[PDB]
């Protein structure tokens, strides 16, 4: 069978955070499920393995008595909670399946696996972006093209998905990625080729999607009148 | 913690390559198996092999694993397209009482050839001098390989504070691009005379500057 | 009295309406004086200059527009009148002069860095030739040490 799992989730540092581990199919009520963690810059580590069948806590001594596992018969899925959260939580985490087998060493295996849940917790929570639009200079036009964008600063979650004129045009257009801010926000920028005779005939207008906090901000470039 | 894996390993497309996993006699020399995970940075990691002696199905034979007593060894023959992932070692930990992971070893050269960078430095406009903020934004596009250091000077001082760098993605020319951006205020965004952004690539450097008056 | 004008980092009349020097500027300029044949008795103004420019131009751009700069807000259709002064603008060379204005010859040789093998560049240097002694050599075949 497969097992899907629930997209990004950001929460904050003493929250409680909710996942959700779905089968699609059947052998999920017999056969004991695990989590596995992996994490950019260390090793995957093992918190606990429950039995759905009999509904048995099985952690690791490395981890404290602070997250838990609940397991549902009916609609055959498992939830995870975690509270107090810290600043090493950034990671993701895997839904994993257990098979036993028979021989000398009999080790846990983890044949099937899960999709991932990307976790991400800092400061700086979700709040209303700022766009800036940005007009070419005439100093900074040399040949036939022209070179403008969208900026979008000081904003909260990851992912944002932008668009030109709701994708009429898609020639030339780059994405960049965003970075790590040290008070803890993200900046991407997003600029396309344009040539120096359709600067003032037609117009480019940048949209934004914040779907976390459900926002659609429409910006207006304009050339500037001094250079 | 108790398991360590080699960070890398060379090798060549056509020669066999091996590695090893090294621990302690109370997890893998103690008697149980172990298991070989491959951690591809984009998909999940799934099964490749168990117990070092049955194949699993959607496996191909290539894989190879044994057990040298305390320690643990992979084989493979042939660098294919799809070895650009990470190998971690697990099994089953008396002391921990659980499962424990490896380190992780990346299989990976270089194999980037130079090419030309292209910078292009962008001031600020009239309607972000009012948000009490001074954002500088110097964007690089067409270089390979992307890995392009990033100065910020004022003509009198390096620039120290707000240096940022993003991570570079592959463009549809199979190009890289990048941004910088840089954290003031239009309090001395004014008083200074000329901002510039200095890269080096390969010994290339090219210098762009603004006039803000 | 133009010549220390050629320099990366300032604004006049002739380096920003001619040829602007960039800031990324490897160039190796050349001048002197040679005043006895570029000039002559009654006034030589064979050679011209633009004084009059809308705006600035990129470095490493040459401008050969002698379209009329305006300066006033009617067109005037090419004629002398007002608001309007032809940019282009003749010298006043004349042998008689002091030091100056003289006429001099001003070279610019700039280097490009690209992702090209060497084409122009020194070879190797012709070093001193030694004899009777322990040396070590490579005549393009071997690299022999003996006297």
């Known amino acids: 069978v497969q097992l899907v799992e629930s997209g990004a989730e950001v929460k904050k540092p003493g929250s409680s955070v909710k996942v959700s581990c779905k089968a699609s199919?059947?052998?999920?009520?017999?056969?004991?499920i695990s989590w596995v963690r992996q994490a950019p810059g260390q090793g995957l580590e093992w918190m606990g393995g429950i039995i759905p069948i009999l509904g048995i806590a099985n952690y690791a001594q490395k981890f404290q008595g602070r997250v838990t596992i609940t397991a549902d018969k009916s609609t055959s899925t498992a939830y995870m909670e975690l509270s107090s959260l810290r600043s090493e939580d950034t990671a993701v985490y895997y839904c994993?399946?257990?098979?036993?087998?028979?021989?000398?060493?009999?080790?846990?295996?983890?044949?099937?696996w899960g999709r991932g849940t990307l976790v991400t917790v800092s400061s700086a929570s979700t709040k209303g972006p700022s766009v800036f639009p940005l007009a070419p200079s005439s100093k900074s036009t040399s040949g036939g093209t022209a070179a403008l964008g969208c900026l979008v600063k000081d904003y909260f979650p990851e992912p944002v998905t932008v668009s030109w004129n709701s994708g009429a045009l898609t020639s030339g257009v780059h994405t960049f990625p965003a970075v790590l801010q040290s008070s803890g926000l993200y900046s991407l920028s997003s600029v396309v080729t344009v040539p120096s005779s359709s600067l003032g005939t037609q117009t480019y207008i940048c949209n934004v999607n914040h779907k976390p906090s459900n926002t659609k901000v429409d910006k207006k470039v304009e050339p500037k009148s001094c250079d | 913690s108790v398991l360590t894996q080699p960070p890398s390993v060379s090798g060549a497309p056509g020669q066999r390559v091996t590695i090893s996993c090294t621990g302690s006699?109370?997890?893998?020399?103690?008697?149980?198996?172990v298991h070989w995970y491959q951690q591809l940075p984009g998909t999940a990691p799934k099964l490749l092999i168990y117990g070092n002696s049955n194949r699993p199905s959607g496996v191909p034979d290539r894989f190879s694993g044994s057990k040298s007593g305390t320690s643990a060894s992979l084989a493979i023959t042939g660098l294919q397209a799809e070895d650009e992932a990470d190998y971690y070692c697990?099994?089953?930990?008396?002391?921990?009482?659980?499962?424990?992971f490896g380190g992780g070893t990346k299989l990976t050269v270089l194999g980037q050839p130079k090419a030309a960078p292209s910078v292009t430095l962008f001031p600020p406009s009239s309607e972000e001098l009012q948000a009490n903020k001074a954002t500088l934004v110097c964007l690089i596009s067409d270089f390979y390989p992307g890995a392009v250091t990033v100065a910020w000077k004022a003509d009198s001082s390096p620039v120290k504070a707000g240096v940022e760098t993003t991570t570079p993605s592959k463009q549809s020319n199979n190009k890289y691009a990048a941004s910088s951006y840089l954290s003031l205020t239009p309090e001395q965004w004014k008083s200074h005379r000329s901002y510039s952004c200095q890269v080096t690539h390969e010994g290339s450097t090219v210098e762009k500057t603004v006039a803000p008056t | 009295d133009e010549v220390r004008q050629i320099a990366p980092g300032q604004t006049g009349k002739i380096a920003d309406y001619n040829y602007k020097l960039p800031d990324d500027f490897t160039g190796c300029v050349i001048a002197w004086n040679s005043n006895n044949l570029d000039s002559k008795v009654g006034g030589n103004y064979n050679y011209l200059y633009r004084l009059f420019r809308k705006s600035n131009l990129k470095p490493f751009e040459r401008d050969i527009s002698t379209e009329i700069y305006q300066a006033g807000s009617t067109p005037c259709n090419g004629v002398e009148g007002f608001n309007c002064y032809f940019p282009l603008q003749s010298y006043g060379f004349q042998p008689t002069n002091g030091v100056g204005y003289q006429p001099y010859r001003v070279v610019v040789l700039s280097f490009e860095l690209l992702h090209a093998p060497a084409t122009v560049c020194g070879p190797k240097k012709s070093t001193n030739l030694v004899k009777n002694k322990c040396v070590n050599f490579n005549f393009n075949g071997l690299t022999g040490t003996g006297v």
């Open positions: 697990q099994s089953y930990d008396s002391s921990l009482s659980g499962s424990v």
């Open positions: 006699s109370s997890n893998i020399g103690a008697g149980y198996d």
């Open positions: 199919g059947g052998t999920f009520s017999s056969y004991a």
């Open positions: 994993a399946r257990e098979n036993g087998y028979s021989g000398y060493g009999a080790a846990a295996n983890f044949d099937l």
